[PDB]
Design a protein around this ligand. Structure first.
Ligand SMILES: NC(=O)c1ccc[n+]([C@@H]2O[C@H](COP(=O)([O-])OP(=O)(O)OC[C@H]3O[C@@H](n4cnc5c(N)ncnc54)[C@H](O)[C@@H]3O)[C@@H](O)[C@H]2O)c1
Ligand SMILES: NC(=O)c1ccc[n+]([C@@H]2O[C@H](COP(=O)([O-])OP(=O)(O)OC[C@H]3O[C@@H](n4cnc5c(N)ncnc54)[C@H](O)[C@@H]3O)[C@@H](O)[C@H]2O)c1
Ligand SMILES: NC(=O)c1ccc[n+]([C@@H]2O[C@H](COP(=O)([O-])OP(=O)(O)OC[C@H]3O[C@@H](n4cnc5c(N)ncnc54)[C@H](O)[C@@H]3O)[C@@H](O)[C@H]2O)c1
Ligand SMILES: NC(=O)c1ccc[n+]([C@@H]2O[C@H](COP(=O)([O-])OP(=O)(O)OC[C@H]3O[C@@H](n4cnc5c(N)ncnc54)[C@H](O)[C@@H]3O)[C@@H](O)[C@H]2O)c1
Ligand SMILES: NC(=O)c1ccc[n+]([C@@H]2O[C@H](COP(=O)([O-])OP(=O)(O)OC[C@H]3O[C@@H](n4cnc5c(N)ncnc54)[C@H](O)[C@@H]3O)[C@@H](O)[C@H]2O)c1
Ligand SMILES: NC(=O)c1ccc[n+]([C@@H]2O[C@H](COP(=O)([O-])OP(=O)(O)OC[C@H]3O[C@@H](n4cnc5c(N)ncnc54)[C@H](O)[C@@H]3O)[C@@H](O)[C@H]2O)c1
Lengths: 169, 169, 169, 169, 169, 169
């Protein structure tokens, strides 16, 4: 049984990311989705806490009919040592075989540790990235389109827009 | 929409705990299951890492037909300050309303923070607790009975018995 | 009893800060004065150690005759979790009713935690900010004027000018 | 100026400690009073947070007629490296000259750094220990008589008894 | 090149430890000597600081003529995550091939990480353990005998006996 | 015995630093060499782990004919409190007397603690900075000539070039 690993900040979790996740789910049996930088919250760049993000990511995946048996959602706070980050991820995740990531460091860190590393099967355009979303949330610009309905609801509940706006004064 | 919170070490996740979880699931809409002491591993008292435990707890819940939309599985490392632990749980979980727990500290900490706290609707006997399980794993005594099949499989994969035994020399 | 809270780096404690403290003291019974970033020291931006600033405040608030029963001085180091910061502050301070701040992040954080948040009743021009005081110590300007005597005295003892000047080299 | 240092858990602050403090003032211009183990709270041995203790101290010292210029109250959280604790204490406090401690480690550590060290002037009788005080709160005893009224009023506000008692269950 | 690894508290470095180190040096090209619990100091159990023990080893290994090209001395503080410990050790040490330990936990940890694990080639009676050395310094026994001269010399400089004796009071 | 201290990132160790080290030995009985920022690795500015650096140092010092009794190599991880760094350094090293540093903060901090401080004897030309060395590895330049062979052999073993280059993508 083959398990893959993915790591992203998910600020917030958007359709782009989701399309990538479904993509990987066609190559592996189970995917371990790691919410990176779980310590950052309340900032224009990282406005949501690990909690809210686990929530968005949980409701969005069970909303798209993706069987809980196919994935794991784990928060991962950043640590001072790059040389200890993989060991850090490993202690928080189930045993995995392939690491999906197009980031040089993440690739190199896992690569150096013996894992098989590849780039995600899909690449979404910046127009769909969180920066657009957050940018729209502030500039009142239909950020919802870029997000899964369940995620909009999470954002609605936690007053995501109100927050990111005040933090922007 | 009502959400409850539960916190346990889950070393390992056993049928007792599971029966309690299904119990709470009849009173609340969603349950946030917190794997406490996520930093302890490789010891007779706490032999499994946060990772393996998220895994057991994930496979056992999707094995009993419990809809992913009804729960959240979050690791929670212990912190030096009891006075900051609830804020610690809150930052890692989705917004919750009721805290289930029969432990004086956990009750008092959440109670003091404004949350509604009650005792779990069900109480399993020690013969079913992790101490029995671990005790059996060492003493070769049919620990499997006490655990959900999916959990046995996790334990099998990570060589749980081999580990806890060596740690016991 | 009305307890308010204020939080700033006080690097160093200058007259404006005291003008504001005196004014907040007109609408609240007691004022909790939290020394932010208590862990930063020996830098052009943050030259004094938490210890020294706790000395500056205590000495200035006395020099200006202010019943010690009306204020508290508590150092507070920064934590990597903004979502944990308020609970952190709370754990180190007497129970308070209102928070005084102009910073959006401090404002939002304390607000999301359910506290009454408000702006200081007085805003002081940069001309009298810590930057101006620090820049003078460096360029041999008139820094003593921008500060309470007891503060000038503390700075002389610890050799603040000497230190800040060396670090500038 | 001759500043002396004093360190203790103060769980909670009792008349005994107070007289000791007055005694020390009789031989030191100023008394830097460090509240140890600031990170512990909500346990039988350490019921109060630090902020709570900072309140008791600040209140008792202002109600027993003691110049706010003659003392400092600094919460100090314990740290793993004993060989780095005195430095820690220093960093969080004003400059001192003599350490008043009855504890061997506290003595050996401060002296090792070169500080003048000497035992506490008085040695308040028993019936004046946090233990007896905490015990009475548990067993409905007369703890109030062992604490300065100013402190008793604090314990009432934070419902200490109710806490220590629930925690005790 | 065959690099082995050893790890112990060395509180203090005694003859037996050296007898074992010399023997491990007969089957490996270089030996990585990790000073465990580098954060503990000033206690009856762990009296010396990482600094001092790094001095003891370096001085003893030289006194006994051992090419410096054959060994490394690296302090290692303990971390709360056993599952992270090996990666921690690795980050601080040259690449190694085999680990020498009698402790089950160190054995299991390094083993689960894929390293060759083996017992020291020599076991020394308690009579010559750190406990015996420490107990003599306290009871005025013959501690110098149980240790290499360079070690006795280091202990004299830092006043190890004085310290250990005071902490005993 | 007159021990002097030296601190640097050594990313990586080059001939320049080495000559500086020999120079210092010409005026100090022993040289405590602290490798700073031990917690950084796998970045362009800090490619090597600490264990890697400890290897380069240990190797270069044993191959350039220098008595293992005349030096110590101690990895030092940076810490948040500048006012607690020299104490930190102390705790991890043998007792020293003089600090050789060209850095203003390092100077101001050590001197503030009372240590004799003086600049590095030599001032090795440019073309001998980690920057140039790291640059050459990136641009297939001749970095080897800037490092002692002993170090070059280390970089080859940990495939530094391959790393810094991938990281660079
Ligand atoms: N030492 C440490 O603590 C350490 C070391 C490495 C990484 N991390 C963490 O790992 C997490 C992952 O970081 P990362 O480098 O992937 O950055 P990231 O998760 O922040 O994403 C980087 C960029 O990649 C884009 N992206 C991601 N997947 C994409 C895809 N399939 N198609 C198109 N664009 C895509 C994102 O929109 C974003 O702008 C972070 O939270 C980081 O902090 C921590
Ligand atoms: N400051 C802090 O870091 C802090 C403060 C409080 C709690 N915690 C953490 O919270 C977690 C929860 O601790 P806890 O007090 O519940 O202890 P626990 O999870 O270890 O469980 C305590 C005992 O309760 C039993 N139990 C649990 N639910 C039961 C039920 N329904 N019926 C019968 N028996 C049951 C378990 O088998 C166990 O023996 C721990 O991991 C603890 O470390 C951390
Ligand atoms: N997670 C965390 O650790 C966390 C989260 C938030 C804030 N903090 C800390 O809170 C502390 C307070 O930060 P802050 O945002 O107030 O910044 P600050 O204290 O550094 O002050 C910000 C600026 O506002 C000016 N200012 C303050 N009060 C003023 C007034 N009444 N009139 C005019 N100018 C005024 C100051 O002179 C300064 O230039 C900091 O130490 C910060 O690090 C920590
Ligand atoms: N590395 C570290 O984090 C580190 C190292 C050393 C000490 N500390 C801290 O230092 C603090 C001080 O501890 P401590 O040993 O003084 O304990 P303490 O003062 O909190 O209590 C020790 C006992 O001394 C008694 N006592 C004190 N003065 C007395 C007097 N004059 N007459 C009679 N009885 C008296 C108290 O009633 C109490 O029972 C602790 O909070 C400890 O955590 C921390
Ligand atoms: N997570 C973590 O931080 C973590 C996990 C595991 C181990 N460690 C550390 O690893 C270090 C090593 O621990 P350890 O288990 O070896 O304990 P230890 O170094 O304290 O030694 C254990 C006992 O074994 C004895 N001993 C050692 N070698 C011997 C030999 N060849 N013959 C006879 N007796 C011998 C010692 O004298 C001692 O009484 C410790 O500092 C420990 O804290 C840390
Ligand atoms: N609180 C803390 O954690 C804290 C406080 C202070 C310093 N530090 C650490 O101290 C370490 C030392 O830093 P640093 O400032 O010495 O930097 P460094 O030595 O790592 O580099 C500074 C520059 O000095 C150059 N240099 C040094 N000696 C020279 C000489 N004789 N001739 C020519 N050029 C020379 C180096 O080539 C380099 O470019 C750092 O790793 C830093 O992180 C940490």
């Amino acid at each position: 049984t083959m398990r893959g690993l993915l790591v992203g900040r998910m600020q917030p979790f958007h359709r782009g990311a989701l399309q990538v996740i479904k993509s990987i789910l066609e190559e592996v049996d189970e995917l371990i989705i790691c919410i990176g930088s779980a310590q950052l919250s309340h900032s224009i760049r990282d406005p949501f806490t690990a909690g809210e993000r686990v929530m968005m990511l949980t409701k969005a995946l069970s909303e798209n009919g993706i069987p809980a048996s196919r994935y794991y959602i784990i928060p991962v706070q950043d640590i001072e040592c790059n040389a200890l980050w993989v060991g850090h991820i490993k202690m928080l995740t189930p045993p995995f075989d392939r690491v999906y990531s197009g980031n040089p460091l993440v690739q190199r860190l896992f690569s150096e540790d013996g894992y098989e590393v590849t780039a995600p099967p899909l690449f979404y355009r910046d127009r769909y990235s969180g920066t657009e979303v957050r940018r729209r949330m502030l500039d009142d610009g239909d950020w919802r389109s870029l997000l899964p309905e369940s995620v909009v609801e999470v954002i609605d509940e936690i007053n995501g827009v109100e927050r990111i706006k005040h933090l922007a004064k």
